[PDB]
Symmetry: C5
Subunit: 394 residues, 5 copies
Amino acid sequence: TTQPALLRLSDHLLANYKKGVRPVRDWRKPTTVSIDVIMYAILNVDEKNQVLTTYIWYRQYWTDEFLQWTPEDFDNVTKLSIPTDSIWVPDILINEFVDVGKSPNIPYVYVHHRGEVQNYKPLQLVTACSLDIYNFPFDVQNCSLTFTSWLHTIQDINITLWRSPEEVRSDKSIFINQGEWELLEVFPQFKEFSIDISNSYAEMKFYVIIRRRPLFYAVSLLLPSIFLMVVDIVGFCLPPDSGERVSFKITLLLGYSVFLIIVSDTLPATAIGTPLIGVYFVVCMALLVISLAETIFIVRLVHKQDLQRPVPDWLRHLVLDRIAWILCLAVRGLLQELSSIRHFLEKRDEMREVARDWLRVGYVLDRLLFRIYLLAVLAYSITLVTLWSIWHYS
Amino acid sequence: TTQPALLRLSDHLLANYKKGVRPVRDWRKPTTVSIDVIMYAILNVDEKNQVLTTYIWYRQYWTDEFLQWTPEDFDNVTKLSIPTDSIWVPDILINEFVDVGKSPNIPYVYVHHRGEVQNYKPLQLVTACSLDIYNFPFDVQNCSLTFTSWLHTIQDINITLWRSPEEVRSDKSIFINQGEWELLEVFPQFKEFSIDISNSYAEMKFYVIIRRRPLFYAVSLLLPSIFLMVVDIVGFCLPPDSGERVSFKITLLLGYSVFLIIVSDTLPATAIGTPLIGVYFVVCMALLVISLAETIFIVRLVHKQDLQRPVPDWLRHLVLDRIAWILCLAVRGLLQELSSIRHFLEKRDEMREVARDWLRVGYVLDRLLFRIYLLAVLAYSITLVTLWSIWHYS
Amino acid sequence: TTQPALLRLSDHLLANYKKGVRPVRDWRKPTTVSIDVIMYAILNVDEKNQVLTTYIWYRQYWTDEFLQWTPEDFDNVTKLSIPTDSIWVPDILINEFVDVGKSPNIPYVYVHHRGEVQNYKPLQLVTACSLDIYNFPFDVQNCSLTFTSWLHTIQDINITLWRSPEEVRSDKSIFINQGEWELLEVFPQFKEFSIDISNSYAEMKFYVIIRRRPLFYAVSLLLPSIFLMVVDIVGFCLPPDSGERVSFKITLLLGYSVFLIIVSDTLPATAIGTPLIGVYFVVCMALLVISLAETIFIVRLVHKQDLQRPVPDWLRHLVLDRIAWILCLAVRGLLQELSSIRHFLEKRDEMREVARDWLRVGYVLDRLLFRIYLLAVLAYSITLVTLWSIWHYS
Amino acid sequence: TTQPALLRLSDHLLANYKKGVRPVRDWRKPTTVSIDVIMYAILNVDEKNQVLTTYIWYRQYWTDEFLQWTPEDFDNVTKLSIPTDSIWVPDILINEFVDVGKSPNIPYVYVHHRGEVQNYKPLQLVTACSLDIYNFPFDVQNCSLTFTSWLHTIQDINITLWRSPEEVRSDKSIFINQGEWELLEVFPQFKEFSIDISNSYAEMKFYVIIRRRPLFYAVSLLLPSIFLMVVDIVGFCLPPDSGERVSFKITLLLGYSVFLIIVSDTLPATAIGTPLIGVYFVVCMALLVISLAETIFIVRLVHKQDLQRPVPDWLRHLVLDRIAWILCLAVRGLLQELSSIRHFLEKRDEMREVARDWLRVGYVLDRLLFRIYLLAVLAYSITLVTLWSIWHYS
Amino acid sequence: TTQPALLRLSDHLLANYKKGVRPVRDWRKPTTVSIDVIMYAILNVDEKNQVLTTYIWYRQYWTDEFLQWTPEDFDNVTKLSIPTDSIWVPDILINEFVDVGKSPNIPYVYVHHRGEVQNYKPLQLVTACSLDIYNFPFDVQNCSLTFTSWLHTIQDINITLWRSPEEVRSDKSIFINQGEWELLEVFPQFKEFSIDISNSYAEMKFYVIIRRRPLFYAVSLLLPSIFLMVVDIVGFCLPPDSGERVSFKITLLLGYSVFLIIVSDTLPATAIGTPLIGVYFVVCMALLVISLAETIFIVRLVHKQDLQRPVPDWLRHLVLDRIAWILCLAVRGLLQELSSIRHFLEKRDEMREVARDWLRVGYVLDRLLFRIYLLAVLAYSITLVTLWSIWHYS
Ligand SMILES: *[C@@H]1O[C@H](CO)[C@@H](O[C@@H]2O[C@H](CO)[C@@H](O)[C@H](O)[C@H]2NC(C)=O)[C@H](O)[C@H]1NC(C)=O
Ligand SMILES: *[C@@H]1O[C@H](CO)[C@@H](O[C@@H]2O[C@H](CO)[C@@H](O)[C@H](O)[C@H]2NC(C)=O)[C@H](O)[C@H]1NC(C)=O
Ligand SMILES: O=C1c2cccc3c2C(CCC3)CN1[C@H]1CN2CCC1CC2
């Protein structure tokens, strides 16, 4: 021989190698591939369509008895690059595909001098995992990735791991943070399933566990919710007989009904169960309609509508009690004329003294309903805080 | 001979095999493929464009007389992997395509030692089926998938089933739940049609039947609909002569007219027939304009506009009836001066006693219209419930 | 010879067949292709960009003198499948392309024993046709599809029809209904054009004619338009001196100005001419500003602003006419005191009797303007109906 | 020889033709391609991203000395079709690419008997040109297309034009009108640039000039702008002491503040300079806040707040001037009682005569501010018209 | 030999060249590629998904010992074009890929007569860099591009630079301005990293630094923010006892609550930290609720609700102080009748003189709260300006 290059090694291997035949001497021994993954980013989690988008890195290796030389007498060449096309490559796919992601192709593989080839490639994957929105800002997710052969049986292609499974779980090395989702754990599991007798299919399940960072939503839905409670505490200080107190409490009720609709499109509500913040917005209405349905009771109670004098059953029940429970011939002709004038004024006087008494009752009930409304907001806001400190601690 | 591998089998088959010729000995015998499907997910059901998106799995098998060896003397090899490119593959397409979905390709097939090849592949499909939105939250759909050869006639390619058709119907095995659509049944049917004499085309129709889960829409359109009825029950308790009762009933009517428009874009209305909830929102207006068009009648009836005394035809018709039907020289010079003063006061007195009487009539009609409005809402809400319990039961 | 298969026919044809050369014996005889189409669906009609999207089916056939055997002595084989790659295939494209639609490829053709090949393929096409929105819900469209060779001249490739043109026009066989567009007619036409001397290019024009179903828009723009006229008929029943009648007529005018903007994005207005419903919304404003600009005239007319007595020119012109046109020392010291008291009351009396008279005039004009406003709506709504019955009939 | 076909010409050329070598005898003579374009449609002009989308047609031709036969003795064949793959094809790209448009491929070229090949192909292109939004409805644009070789130098590939440049400018032949953009001119220009010594690169610049049709925006932003000026001319006719005049002028000011925001997303504002209609909407506010800030001055001026009598400095300045500038023991015991009654009435009389005088001043200023507001709108609307007639003329 | 062309050079090289083998004589010497980039445009910076889109140009060169001739005796040919397919091409990818951009392919390379090939290609890239929105209109970004081999180790492929790194930093030559992002610097850096022992991977990091032009957002969020402060300065000039002052201050508060929501979707808020303009909108509310919560205090203070006389503790504290701190038998029978009349009038007089005194106090507090509100806006607006002049200067 002569010394052209290392390329006469590359002629020695790929002269009679056939691309399609599965590379083994005896047809009973299965080819054993060995995979490994690393999470890189989490592009999109679509709650409505149950579709999760993920870019990962990937590598795998398998042995074969056709690409096998002796390293001596080929000028000590140990490894080698060979293009991906001219090598038998196994088909390993994800069961949970719903679409084909766009990923770069890598046109080279390694080949060691025992037959061990290696294959690095990245791949974007769009899968379909089941999500739960039972507790919306504070939620973990548990989506699956299932690597399997698509055609070959378990006496044909078998799947193990590159590294130990304890080392895969704590591999948070290149993951992109600052991106709405925090990666916790990548847990592998082997499992064999059979859809029929004498047809077994090996598979390998990776479980990813991600947790949403709740900080983005404590300003987008907590801030306008408590803000339309601090207005109604200001709103009760209007005296009820003015006329704008009814017009005040309907404007912001309109103003909050716009808020429930313009947010609900950006907050998803998928299958069984509603998110638990949706209950905590209905209670925001019941402290707002009851605030509306008591000023209707006072305006009806304090008005000038030629009404009767208030009842002494409910005068000493209210006025003299609640200041200590919580709060604190020509002569007779003109005499006929003058007395008729006084009769036209004294019934004008009588109609105003009656209207003072209901108006006196109407302020005592307004201060009394103002306190228990102030205690209903105060006892509700402390229950909201103590369910936030339990989660935040540990 | 020698013993290189099993690959000398792979050289024995694919040495003179021609890819394009249809593989049969006698040209009169038709090649019979045999298909099978399993639903996996339902990605999108677009009501407006009548387009349905679905990811399924798929397998098929056919015989041929060129790939046929004896298993003895090839070291007992029974099955084999061969790349998909070097084999005649029949063209089986869906008639209802409108676009090409993106699906992974599988580069291998099996070949048994009688000639039976097999072919597993997944495929995303976007079809065009006719949808009905006649009853929007409670609806089944009946979309079709039609597998057929695209070119060959029925004496060239014929289609049967892998499994029995009773086993295909009850195959809900890998379907993704928790996803807006519940799969009920996949029903197969064979049918032969001819577009011309001496040109018959076999086909195979799969019917899918899906049912929408109505739970997502009982919070997005039922809750604000009944909520703007519980405000108007509070709204009638304002006394009509105050002035804000007209301003109250127009604000929420504005507030509901925003609601009909911001929802109608997310609820589709396609061909013939409107959805039956659209009728049940027009009746929500007729209990809201009539609630508006009666407070206009009371405010016109109770006002100070130098009006005449109310008519005794309609005084004893109303006031004395409806409390039992439902509800319950210097002397004469000053005498000229004083009597003229009393005349200026007694007509001031007379104009207020007239205005008390209409004001008395105006409250009796307000309580009477409040009851039959309270019975119109009550008799309408029970009809809404009993049409929900009939569907929910069985 | 021996009897391997029919495949020795497939070796007899494709042994020396050259793919690129146009297949004819004498170079002067033109190759004549023959096309045919069937509409399948109409995916999208974008009015703004003048782009129309359509999925059709398609077939064509041509003769050639190289693929020509005798059916005797090849075991009577009449037709044959040959892959699409190894055959000269003519380039027939649409002139109106603006993009490339995604369509499945069909890898087989037929070949008869005279040389006639056939070629079935479906193809999605996005074209650019000119649309008119002159009458928006009731409109036909006339878009063109032009099949032509892209390179070859008319002495090289010539185009005729498969079927008679009378049979193509009435082929509504597989078209998907229930989809916003109704197909009427597919009309073919042959035409030869030359862009230069000695360079003629054959082409074939198909005209499609589609008609929009107007039912979807009689609920999305007719219903809120007439609904904000039935409120203003209720709106005039408020007495004008109350104070909310000005506040009533501005709220719904705000409420309709929101409606004109939130709809106009979903209703297109392209080149020359506005759609004729846009005129019928401006007239909806002129019956709404004039309804606003007359209650401003009454409130200015009926008010307490120390005004003068109304003019007897316009008292007998109005009050006594329009009830028949349409509607129906100590003594003198106290005498100095008492007469000064009466002078302070009689000018209080005089200022109210003046304010009764304008207030009397103000109600007669309000009933008179209420009738001719009720006749202006009534005479306008019957003109709207009779332009709907002319189109609906025939 | 024999007479198989014209195909022995196609064997004579492509037997030893090598695809990759640049086809010239002497390596010093440059290959000269010659291009030409025709605009077809303008799909999208994205102002925000500075990206312009265009579909054009394209053709080019070049000579080579390898594809060259004598037309005699090959049965007089002058031209020929050859597939695009087996020919050296130059790389001509656009410098302004930002993405790859989707365009059909044409698999054939012509070859004449001197060596001149020809090549027709259409191509969608997305470029990046700089746009100016300095005057939004009335604007021309000047975007560039630069055809150049991407690798070869100017002694390797050189670019000229097919036709004369005067004939290219006035080629508006197949352009799709009725589509928001009117094509004016396509102007070619040759230019040679060098990025380094001894490395020159030929290029060819086409300038397109397009003009927006402004008709679509005279109904989407001119009509609601002048419409909320004809309401405020009606709005001043309310008398100021009524109470709704303040509530009237705030509702439509709210109503126009919604309008500025819901439009500004559909009207772009890119780099340096704001569009000149944005100035003409700020002036629409200054005629609307000043209309608001003068009714605040009148309501403060006309009110009952136990105020003092108006000053005679400003009484004869206003009231007596502006009607000609623009507008036009028992006895004494009862005497103690009666005089005290008159004292309680005469100060009630005095407080109303003071309130008549400010109320008299308040109407004269309201008519005076109504005229100069009516002249400020009138003098502004004529300036708006005369800037529209200058552009519309020529 | 003869003289066919230069093409016998192209036959001399590519006769025995093998495409897949890495082209070096001795397998120990690494192949050294050398890259260079130029920014062209910045298409999109998506803050929410942390994805940045960029179109760049790119070139690289490497040596090999197989493509090497002597320029003498081949008619002095120095360089040459060879198609890209038939040459070993190294795999250089970006680590930060999340998708595959669409870019044109260049089918030619140069080859010099020493072995140096060259390769020009453009490529669109979508990467994933970490963004900070800590200060929203005034922000620089620091995103990375990392060119590396994907498979080969550092004794196999090594990466250096074409030009000096000082020349790459100041290369702003073809960058498209007028496009929301200004390019500052492109800084290169070499770094070697090892993921394992005996496996080192060379890489090359380019840092891009871009700065947002803040001019687009000084009209979209600064202008309506200060505009709803100039209305409330007009808003306090209404006298508080009128009745519309409460209705005025709630309409624009509704009007600004719409503004905070319709803008917050177009302004992103990603990971840790809120943008600093979000603090400067909360302070816009605290100058707006406090403006609301003081007119509630005045309306409660000035009202007719049969209240008591104001306290002389707080009369001389306020009224007599703040004008210098800041602001400036028949006889007795009628005597029984007449004195009873005077008693009915003098308590009518007394109830109005009490209501004058609170009304006098209520105006002095309104002018006093008007000044310190005018100083709170003035002292806040100057702090906003001086934080704009520090950034604008240098
Ligand atoms: C659609 O538009 C074309 C416009 O070209 C119509 O074309 C005319 O068709 C008639 C026959 O119906 C020919 O005699 C004319 O010469 C055509 N016009 C031109 C300019 O060539 C076509 O009829 C239209 N479709 C319908 C249904 O009216
Ligand atoms: C579009 O912009 C180009 C800018 O380069 C204009 O270019 C100039 O064109 C004139 C001839 O019309 C040349 O003499 C100048 O040298 C060009 N300028 C430069 C900087 O090279 C072009 O005219 C513009 N189009 C129109 C219609 O005005
Ligand atoms: O893909 C991978 C990859 C995939 C799976 C497991 C592991 C890796 C590593 C590191 C070891 C663990 C590196 N990498 C890439 C990083 N660099 C770019 C391509 C690889 C080599 C260099």
